[PDB]
Amino acid sequence: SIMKILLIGDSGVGKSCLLVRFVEDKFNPSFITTIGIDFKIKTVDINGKKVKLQIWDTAGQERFRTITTAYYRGAMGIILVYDITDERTFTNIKQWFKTVNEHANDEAQLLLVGNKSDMETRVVTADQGEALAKELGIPFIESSAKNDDNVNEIFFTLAKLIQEKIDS
Amino acid sequence: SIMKILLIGDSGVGKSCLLVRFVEDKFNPSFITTIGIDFKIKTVDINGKKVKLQIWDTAGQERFRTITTAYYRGAMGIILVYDITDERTFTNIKQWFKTVNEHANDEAQLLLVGNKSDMETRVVTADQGEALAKELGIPFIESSAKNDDNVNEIFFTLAKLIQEKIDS
């Protein structure tokens, strides 16, 4: 069938790069901010089952974040992304979390992603992210759209979680 | 949200220069006295919460101090500034304080600023300002619009205090 998935998080954390790296195996070194929202798709196989993922890449910019909250309701999966080199984007996850609860479904599967694990300039530790994840009650994973680490895992695991949910 | 902020204090203490240095990162070495009042704005980000600051730069000259007192009521933040190289401007803070209590709101957040910390001709010590601050019951900070020291801090901290007041 089809799974609607959203990527949310501060502007600059790498939502678009994780998406491009996953769907087109490329990486843009430049910063090309997302206006309002973007939409892509890819077919994944969940234990034999071929599932279509409709990925909604949202704008992190504050002004374009009203267009987004409207897409929350109806999403089967929501990926909250922060930048491990930017402490502010991590602290902001809590606010993103609240926004999600006010607009998402009940059965929506969340996932926290600490992106840019390839950077020596990291300021947010893996343990910090795991701790935030345990406190929010959602799964956690670190990634790097640049070196392509755990990028596919992000989407495959979220799909599997949603699918497991579909069986109940 | 909208935070209305006022800068008051004797003519010549540096109210306009702290404002210009904050909003346009410049510094006028010349003395261009303010006639009655002036008004500027800048968007500040208090903990991931972008707020608009409407800065009202008042005239220090005695003849205009009537056009100003009218703007007191309704201000959320009030910055009382004195010149550390001019003892008279510091002693006058007490009178400025009284004027504020007669015209400001109850929830108005005050802040005492000793400006021109870059001058070797200082005559008012930091301890003296701290003492006046403790006696008046308001926060204190020293700045230099010229060398750009604690200039942003003045406005960021006042906004944070007002916001903390808000989330209540």
Ligand SMILES: Nc1nc2c(ncn2[C@@H]2O[C@H](COP(=O)(O)OP(=O)(O)NP(=O)(O)O)[C@@H](O)[C@H]2O)c(=O)[nH]1
């Ligand atoms: N080193 C490194 N840089 C990355 C990584 N992912 C993204 N970036 C860089 O970080 C910047 C922002 O990435 P981008 O994907 O555009 O961020 P966004 O979250 O989609 N921004 P917006 O919400 O404005 O649309 C870009 O210059 C990009 O190349 C990563 O894993 N490692």
Ligand SMILES: Nc1nc2c(ncn2[C@@H]2O[C@H](COP(=O)(O)OP(=O)(O)NP(=O)(O)O)[C@@H](O)[C@H]2O)c(=O)[nH]1
């Ligand atoms: N050395 C030094 N001079 C400063 C500083 N701030 C302001 N000045 C100088 O003090 C003089 C008057 O500053 P100004 O900002 O106009 O003072 P004001 O409080 O706004 N005066 P008025 O109430 O009449 O409008 C100018 O010559 C200016 O360059 C500072 O931090 N350091």
Ligand SMILES: [Mg+2]
């Ligand atoms: Mg983007």
Ligand SMILES: [Mg+2]
């Ligand atoms: Mg002035």
